[PDB]
Every structure is written in structure tokens, then in C-alpha cells.
Write a protein that binds this ligand. Structure first.
Ligand SMILES: [Cl-]
Ligand SMILES: [Cl-]
Ligand SMILES: [Zn+2]
Ligand SMILES: [Zn+2]
Lengths: 495, 474
């Protein structure tokens, strides 16, 4: 909320190479200042050369602009015309100083950011001194530095949740924490890794049944075709999805070995055989740099399937889904139950189409979920419009400023947490907009905007919710569920 | 030309005539204990003991015989001449420092405190050293083959599948994205394996974890040598967003992720991605005891992806870095383990002969556990080992090397011992496993029958149903 004009200040010089040629130089700058540097900006808002002088090889000038026709774009418009002044009538760009004045209400603490020489507060905003050459300006690095600095200006000026639908409350006769109940009765045990669980037969039958319910009650009637998305995700995929914009604190990073040469690894082996300890420090030195991380969001890697491609109109809506593996996230410390794991199992659902087709597809899923949760699971739940899954996993909060782009969360209560217990999110549906098509460069034959959507069904969360509300004895389950399950298997009884 | 074994230590006790009587004593019977005559075990606040010896009743099991009688430790020298054969490579091994490579053998020089022989470090180093030395002193052999069939499809199925829109390469090394058509085939095998093998034989589905930590591999024995082909996993050193703003801001400004900087900010590896699949299951039964009413435990998993760093090159689905497997695991007594083994072979035979109708063979190979921890050859227990299923890929030619698509292993007591699973009666438990590699099944079937349903066996088509269409582009 500061009205200070966003402004760019370039001080540069050009470098075939005479000295006295200034007639057209004067006449070009005016024919730029009131014509060439106009195009793009609204009336009286284009760029301007404000002063200039000369050398024997070089031609220095000061250049100014606001948000339209920016100096680092304006200067290449100039070199173009200035190249057709002293071509047949009678080589590069250097930068003396680059300054951006950005509007801001609050001070902002200086950080290790590349291409920034200095930064300090001024009247109504912040002034940056950039350390940039011509290569950088073609790359549009000043533009990207401005997007960053604004993101952070928003962040300082500062979570979203608001109701859409709720179920009439139900009597809750099972009041214990399902993970404790399942451990006590042989359904599961803890995995070796953090936030990890080994599912015995009883627990596994629950997951499989939930899975089966999604296939028969949602995925088939709606026309979804199974795919197999990969589970090792690379920077390439996260750059295009946008997760490379800040997912870093929550991923499990993967590093391949630098080589299979077993002589290179001989030293690791030996340590272990002598000490019976694994030398993790030594391994860290022998492993490659990370190539990415374990599946975090599940859809991102599907999009390599359609990257760089065009889709015929006959071929949309593309409705696919994946159930081929585990997702991994580094959650908050503290031991939890299945309601907050690090290794989880999700059925990722994805659709591409037009703005309209996408919403219709989203509506259809909402319909089939309500049938399942009301009629088959018979659980107590609700849904709310929330901060988008793509926004959150990329560091940022708030909502998206397109009416219908965002995430709808499904939440259920857990009777063991008491009347004031925070409810648990267990299902989502998101309209992603044009984000994923744009990012992976996926075009549409007839040339309209491609939109996408996605929904993830966390099995561990369905289980937390269904078991907290119904217990583990089948007799008390909805009989519609009890049909799906068949006969419950026996656990592995220990002594 | 060879030599002997001698140990040599220089050490002082930190705690005259009566002491002078023990020279005659110790060298007569006290230290000629666990060693025949002569070999048993020189120079005399601060005493100082120099002592040579042989292989038996070692110097460090002899300075504690002194610790005892001296009622009536700090080391500054410890050398081990070793009967080595030839000139050998220079190795850095924890408790060693010098590794002199002489003409008659190899001399080593350790560095130990008193609280280093109590745990027997020279034991392990020698064991290792001798285990290595004999370096300069896979197994395969046929059990059964099906007779030849004609091979009307002569094309690389992966090349076919890409041309025909079944799949494309994913972003990572040896990695694939399966389109609808290819996904269906996988699911069809799954349903074959379930309905024809798993359900009939009474296996219950469990979900095994997929991020494996060193403790698992330490117990399972892969921590002895699996390193060259693990995909290592590293958590963040912290979730503090302030600790990552430098990474994020680097990307946002430059459009390149800073992988060197990231490697610095991530923690030491906690372990690796799923490699053999079965190891992590054993944490479910570790330290436990089973009533005999429970054996055989017959269990399986199909909850996700295994990852190995395969040999370099462009390969099709027949050699990938990310794969989908069904891990089948049984525990019981020797006899029960051998019986399940045989039940599966019988059920695979039905599948391969008269559902898929392929040309295949089975051979006795190197145990998978041995291969994956650096070893080769065979197991010394005659009934312990791996049976390997192979099939010809016609596109490879008449001389083509057959592809491994299936195994069945009898692991002996290895896993019950490593993870410490007893049986209530105290008979030794044994285990077995079988890995069903779906891309491998998918490479054989398709290389033998093609991508056109018209020519697949009726039994298969029946189970496939009507093929999904692919996703097409311009
Ligand atoms: Cl992801
Ligand atoms: Cl493993
Ligand atoms: Zn998604
Ligand atoms: Zn196995």
C-alpha cells in the first residue's frame, strides 16, 4: 500500500566505431523518445533517454523507464535502430549502473542474492543497485529480480480457510487414537525411517479397499485411464512445475553414486567390516550432487509425458491417474501416528482440458466424493476453500486472483482429539489454471488456453479418519463398507 | 615364497624381584594356553612390555592375562606381518595407518587404545585383510528349458512401444513414463500374479516401506557392499525456511538450481531408496518370536518402486533404474521354505506355459544376497541359492543373450539370523523370496508376441480386456 512509482534507471554506453556523427544520434533519440520507446506502454508511460555524451569509440547515455518498456528491453530497441544509423550512412553494450526503485511499506533485511551490489531504504520504497552486464539484460534477470523483491514485499505485509459444506454432526462412540489401537492389535508397526510405517495384513486390506472404492465409485464412471508416473523427480521437472521456487525444506533428496567403479567404494565397505559402522560422512563425499528428490506432489513428473506437445481437440479432456508408489515429505518433528507420516501412499488424479472442461471435471469429482464419504464410508466431514497446494509447496500464501483457481480441502474430525480437536485434512481437489500447461509448454491445437486440475487421495489419511470415527471392529463399520472388505485377514501373531 | 604371522606390541601398565619371577612363569604355561608348545607367546606408575607371538593366544588376549596376574594399558607400537602373496593396492582401512608392501608379504601398523582390543579390532582387520588377500589366487547352469518356438515378431518392444505411443522416457536416468496402453499390461500381469499364484497359495498383502535406512541394510547384510548401485537419500539439515532462502533466491534469479550449494545444506545420507525390496519388511518381525501355529508366514508387497543404478548406456524397459516389482516372502522351517519354493515354481510354470505362452528356461545362479554385497560363486548350503528365469528376446538374434525376468530364492537362515527372529520351539527358521519384475515380464511377453492383441494368447487377451487408447499429439 505505497503509491511510489516503480522506476528503472539505466546508465550505459554502446560501442561500427567513429566519433563525430551526432546529427542522427540527436534525431534518433527524439524519434525514440516520442515514438519507438512508446510502443507497449499507455500514453506518456514509455521509456526515455534523459541525457547522453560521447567518446572516441563509445557512446554513453542515461535511460529511464517505469514498468512498461523497461530500460533493459528499451536498450535493445535502441541498438537495433542505432545499428541502422551508422551502418551505410557512416558492437556491444556495457553498464555503468543499474537502479530499480520499488515501492514498499516496510524495511527488508539484505540477503545473499546474485547480481545485487547494494540495497537500502528510500522514500516510499526500496532502491536496488544491480551488478549486471548485457548478457543478463537479454536474459531478463532485472525482471526476475523484481518479481523476487515483490514476492518478499508481499510476505512482509502479512493462512486461508473458509467453509463450503459441512455434515450434520454424528455420535462418536469410538474415542481412541487409531494408530495406538492398530499397534496394540497387530495391524501395524513403525518402519525404521522417520514418519514410516509397516502395514501388516489387517491394515493393508483397509488401504486396498479404499483404493478399490476410488477405482469403482469414482475413476471408472468418470472415465479415468490409469498411467504410471515415475517416482524419482528431477530438477528438470521441478523447474517446470515451479516447485524449484521453494520446496527445498520438505523434500527427501536423492544422490546417485559418482561411479559404479567398485574400487571407488572399496573404502566404504572396509570401514563397515572393521567398525560395524557405516561411514556416512565418507559416503556423502562419494555420492554425486543431488539430481532431485523423491516424489513430493506426484503429478509434476507425469507432465514430461505431454511436455513440448500439442493436443488435438478430439483428445481432451485427458483424464489420467496414478497409484504406483510412495510420496515422501520431511514433516514437522515429533512422533506422530498415520495422521502425519513422511512416507505416504496416494492416488494422484490429473486432468487437462479447457477452462470450462476442467471446472466440469472438478465438479464431477466433488460429486463422487460426496457419495463415497456420505454413503459408503458414512463419516463426519466438511470441505473448505483453502490456500492452493501449488502456492504452498512453492513457499507462498494467500489465494490465486482468478475466481476459480485454488484448492478445496476435505477435513474430518478425530473423536480422540476432543470437542476442540483440530480436524484433519484427508482429500483435496484443485483447479490449477494454466500453470502446468504454460510451465511444461503444452499447447492446444485450436489455440485456446489449456487448463489443468488434480486431486490426491491420501490413503493413510482416509484410514486415520475412518478408523478414528468407526473403530477397528468390523461389526461397527457401515455395512456398505463391510461388503467391500470381504473377510478381514489375520495379522501375524507374535509371542 | 611365503612367510609367517607374528604379532608385536610395545605397551606400558599404569598402576621388582617378585616381578622378575614372572618371566620364567608366563613363557612356560600361562601364555602357552590356547596354543601348542613353543608358539604360545622379550624385553622388560610405569612398566613396559614388549611381546612377540604367533597366530594363537594373541598379544591383546595376553596383555589381559598380565592385567590379571600382576595383582600377585597404553599402546605406542603394534605391528602385524602378514603372509601375503603378491604386491597389493594401497588401502585406507580405519584402524590401520602404515601399509608397507614388502617382498616376503605385507606389513601393517595399527593404532589402538586398550578400549580397542576389548572389542577385538585386529581380529576384524586381519579377517578383512586375509579375506581380501586371497583375491589373486557369476555362476550359471541350466535346470530346464522349453523347446524352441517360432518367433514372428522381430522388433525391440521398447522401440515399438515408443513408436506406437505406449510410453516415453521420464526425465531421470533409466526411467519411463507408462501411458495407458503400457499401464494396462502391467496391471494385467499383477492380476495374473494375484489370481493364479498369490490367492491360490494363500499369501497376505502387506505394505513394505520404500526408503531404507542403514540399520535395515546392516542387518540384511547389504551394508557389506551394495554401495556402487544405491540411490542415496538425504534429508534437509533443517526445515528452517530461512536456511533455504539462499537456494530459492538463487533459482528465482538465475533459473538454475544450485546443486553444489544444495549438497552442502542437505544432511548425511540416512540410507537409500528401495533396492532388494524385502529387507525393510523384516523390521516388522525383528526381535520377535513366532508360535508354530503361524508358520509359514507367506506374505507379499507391491506398494512401489525400486531403484538401482544400472550399467551405462541407452536401454529399453529391459534394463531400467526405476522398476516395479512384486516382492513375495515366506518364513518357516527348512522343509516348509523348500515347499513354498516348489509351489511357486509350479505356479509360474502354469503362468508362463499357458497364460503367456512364452519360450523360457530356468537356471541355478549366484544367490542374490551374495551378488548385492560384493560376492560371487555359489552358496555352501546345497539347497540355498537362486533359481533364475530367462527368456529369449527374438529381436536380439539367434546368438542373443537371454533376459532374466524372474527369480526364486531360498535364503537359508540368513534373514531370521540377521534380524533376530526366533521360533517358539527354537528350531532354526529359514526364509525365501521371489521378485516379480514387471518391466522384465513386459519386455519378454511383448518381444515374443508383439504389441497387437490379435496375436496374443487367448488366455491373456481374456484377462487384458479391451485395450485402452493412448494419448496422441500432433
Ligand atoms: Cl513431485
Ligand atoms: Cl532394500
Ligand atoms: Zn497434483
Ligand atoms: Zn527378496
Amino acid at each position: 500500500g505505497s503509491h511510489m512509482k516503480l522506476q528503472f534507471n539505466l546508465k550505459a554506453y554502446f560501442k561500427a566505431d567513429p566519433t563525430p556523427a551526432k546529427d542522427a544520434i540527436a534525431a534518433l533519440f527524439e524519434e525514440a523518445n516520442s515514438t519507438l520507446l512508446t510502443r507497449g506502454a499507455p500514453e506518456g508511460q514509455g521509456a526515455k533517454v534523459t541525457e547522453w555524451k560521447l567518446g572516441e569509440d563509445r557512446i554513453e547515455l542515461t535511460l529511464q523507464s517505469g514498468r512498461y518498456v523497461r530500460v533493459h528491453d528499451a536498450i535493445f530497441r535502441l541498438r537495433k535502430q542505432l545499428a541502422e544509423a551508422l551502418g551505410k550512412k557512416y558492437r556491444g553494450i556495457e553498464v555503468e549502473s543499474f537502479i530499480i526503485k520499488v515501492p514498499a511499506d516496510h524495511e527488508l533485511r539484505m540477503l545473499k542474492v546474485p547480481y545485487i551490489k547494494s540495497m537500502e531504504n528510500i522514500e516510499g520504497g526500496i532502491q536496488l543497485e544491480l551488478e549486471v552486464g548485457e548478457a543478463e539484460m537479454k536474459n531478463r534477470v532485472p525482471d526476475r529480480i523484481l518479481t523476487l523483491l515483490e514476492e518478499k514485499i508481499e510476505a512482509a505485509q502479512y493462512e486461508h480457510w473458509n467453509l463450503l459444506w459441512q455434515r450434520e454432526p454424528m455420535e462418536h462412540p469410538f474415542k481412541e487414537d487409531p494408530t495406538q489401537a492398530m499397534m496394540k492389535e497387530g495391524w501395524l508397526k513403525r518402519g525404521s525411517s522417520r514418519g514410516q510405517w509397516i502395514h501388516g495384513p489387517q491394515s493393508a486390506r483397509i488401504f486396498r479397499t479404499f483404493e478399490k472404492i476410488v477405482l469403482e465409485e469414482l475413476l471408472e464412471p468418470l472415465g479415468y485411464r490409469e498411467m504410471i508416473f515415475p517416482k524419482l523427480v528431477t530438477w528438470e521437472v521441478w523447474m517446470k512445475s515451479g516447485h524449484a521456487k521453494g520446496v527445498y525444506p520438505e523434500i527427501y533428496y536423492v544422490c546417485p553414486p559418482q561411479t559404479r567403479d567398485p574400487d571407488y567404494w572399496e573404502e566404504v565397505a572396509d570401514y563397515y567390516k572393521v567398525t560395524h559402522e557405516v561411514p556416512t560422512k565418507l559416503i556423502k563425499e562419494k555420492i554425486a550432487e543431488p539430481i532431485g528428490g523423491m516424489c513430493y506432489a506426484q503429478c509434476p513428473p507425469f507432465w514430461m509425458y505431454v511436455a513440448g506437445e500439442t493436443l488435438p481437440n478430439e483428445e481432451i479432456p485427458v483424464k489420467v491417474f496414478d497409484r504406483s508408489g510412495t510420496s515422501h515429505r520431511y514433516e514437522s518433528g515429533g512422533i506422530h501416528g498415520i495422521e502425519r507420516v513422511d512416507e505416504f501412499h496416494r492416488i494422484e488424479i490429473v486432468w487437462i482440458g479447457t477452462k470450462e472442461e476442467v471446472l466440469k471435471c472438478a465438479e464431477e469429482l466433488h460429486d463422487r466424493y460426496m457419495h463415497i464419504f456420505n454413503d459408503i464410508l458414512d463419516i463426519e466431514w466438511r470441505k473448505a476453500r483453502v490456500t492452493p497446494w501449488f502456492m504452498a509447496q512453492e513457499g507462498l500464501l494467500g489465494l490465486a486472483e482468478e475466481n476459480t483457481v485454488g484448492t478445496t480441502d476435505y477435513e474430518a474430525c478425530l473423536p480422540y482429539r476432543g470437542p476442540d480437536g483440530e480436524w484433519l485434512e484427508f482429500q483435496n481437489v484443485s483447479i490449477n489454471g494454466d500453470k502446468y500447461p504454460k510451465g511444461f509448454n503444452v499447447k492446444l491445437q485450436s489455440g485456446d488456453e489449456l487448463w489443468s486440475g488434480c486431486s490426491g487421495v491420501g490413503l493413510e489419511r482416509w484410514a486415520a479418519v475412518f478408523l478414528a470415527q468407526k473403530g477397528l471392529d468390523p461389526a461397527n463399520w457401515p455395512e456398505e463398507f463391510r461388503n467391500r472388505v470381504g473377510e478381514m485377514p489375520k495379522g501375524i501373531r507374535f509371542l
